[PDB]
Write a protein that binds this ligand. Structure first.
Ligand SMILES: [Cl-]
Ligand SMILES: [Cl-]
Lengths: 291, 291
């Protein structure tokens, strides 16, 4: 049901890596003001991997507190252990999240059946809307379209974030589902295209720095206005490239820093954007009218 | 310094998933009796991903206890957060592990410099010998030969497990290194060749079910006896293929069950070996003389 521009929000940090609670509050308010439709708290772009359990709770709690029910909040609760995924997703429910976003277990390479049992076990453990998330380049595993369609039969599995960037494959999944659960782009470069083909929105990195513009791209693409979708997307299309010149969220955090909205903190093994990428990033932001 | 056949040992579990302490103790004893030279506790084959921190501690402690100083014990202490890797590595030091084995951070895709910094930070925080581990198909990142050579300059970084199965690249690493740190194969199909080319050992899945045979292959490969290495490896070469019919450790745990050594317990998202691969695994075991 959640539709539109869903920012995968960064977790702003001080130089020493501590979470920057004031900057996070200001970002949430700005997204709401700028037309962002939903926020994913503590997902990939939010450095879920390097936050403690207590930090994951606090960030979700703070985002929900600041948003004050103006937009739905989706909590990142993915783990590569089924048991830990259940605990994080129960926590998210108890905090009042509207939905949970669960990447396929990474590193341990479950079979397709183990992927199916993993998400079925979580859906049966926790009464909360769950959104699957496939990003094979990170996880070493690819949740096939067939398995996703099977999981769409489980009642609180309500959608999937498709970060393949493979538009023909994503269109095939949307067609096979025939509305049984939602598809969201996880690939800013092609998201406008996948939404014109039926996706319910874009769980977006670029929306961190261009929330108004991405809100407008999602809205027109979801309305099936191909000319406007291309028109609006072209204004920010170079951002969808440059924000991946190193592994997300390294560039997008540096971008936000150039915008004066967060400090440079980012936790190892991630590192501040390498100096050789900074001028090209600065140039792209200036070209897009962002700074 | 650690050389020879180093088993990446499974963590035996009861049908309910609980660790099977009694089977574990028997397996460690059997390894020592059969000739295995060292054990990695709670590595990828040991299901590190689905053990709690407490269970990770307890499995390390039990293996060290049973080994009773007869062979060195390496603890798997890799994490994709540098902070967490430090805590796990510290815990292994305090338990009396001889070394720790640390996979590159998976899922979050650090840059090469961030890999460098992750490992340097750990090495600087914990006075224990550290073995790097590169397995790009699981992690989404590939530690380059050039970064491994840089890391070999750091005190306490004593080796790397190279699971690429790219033999010319591993030879290039061994050559470029010039004894600065150890290289272990992490690919049973090609381990015999890498040891003939100067690797110090094989951190082995196959050793789990053929510990005597693999101890011999490593002995003759390390001794540079090409023809004996070929002949002995040839007797178990089909095992190195069949144990990966589904993601490790799914097949090796089933093989151990067919051997009567452990029960069928395995934690989601992993699953017991699919019913269809069982009869063919049983035939491979028969052919190799294991059952
Ligand atoms: Cl996300
Ligand atoms: Cl291992």
């Amino acid at each position: 049901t959640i539709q539109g521009s869903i920012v995968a929000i960064v977790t702003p940090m001080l130089k020493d890596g501590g979470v920057d609670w004031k900057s996070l509050e200001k970002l949430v308010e700005w997204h709401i003001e700028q037309g962002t439709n939903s926020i994913v708290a503590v997902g990939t772009t939010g450095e879920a991997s390097t936050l403690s359990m207590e930090e994951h709770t606090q960030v979700i709690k703070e985002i929900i507190r600041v948003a004050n029910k103006r937009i739905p909040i989706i909590a990142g609760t993915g783990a590569n252990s089924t048991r830990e995924a259940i605990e994080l997703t129960k926590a998210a429910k108890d905090l009042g999240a509207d939905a949970a976003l669960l990447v396929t277990p990474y590193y341990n390479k479950p079979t397709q059946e183990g992927l199916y049992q993993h998400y079925k076990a979580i859906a049966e453990a926790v009464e909360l809307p769950l959104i699957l998330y496939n990003v094979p380049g990170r996880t070493g595993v690819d949740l096939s379209n067939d398995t996703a369609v099977r999981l769409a039969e489980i009642p609180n599995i309500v959608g999937i974030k498709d970060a393949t960037g493979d538009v023909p494959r994503g269109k095939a999944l949307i067609d096979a589902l025939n509305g049984k659960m939602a598809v969201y782009s996880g690939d800013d470069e092609t998201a406008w295209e996948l939404m014109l083909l039926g996706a319910d929105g874009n769980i977006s990195v670029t929306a961190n720095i261009a929330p108004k513009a991405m809100s407008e791209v999602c809205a027109v693409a979801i309305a099936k206005d191909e000319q406007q979708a291309k028109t609006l997307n072209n204004k920010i299309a170079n951002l969808h490239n440059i924000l991946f010149c190193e592994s997300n969220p390294i560039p997008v955090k540096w971008a936000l820093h150039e915008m004066g909205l967060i400090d440079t903190g980012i936790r190892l093994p991630l590192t501040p954007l390498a100096e050789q990428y900074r001028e090209p990033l600065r140039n792209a932001l200036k070209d897009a009218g962002i700074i």
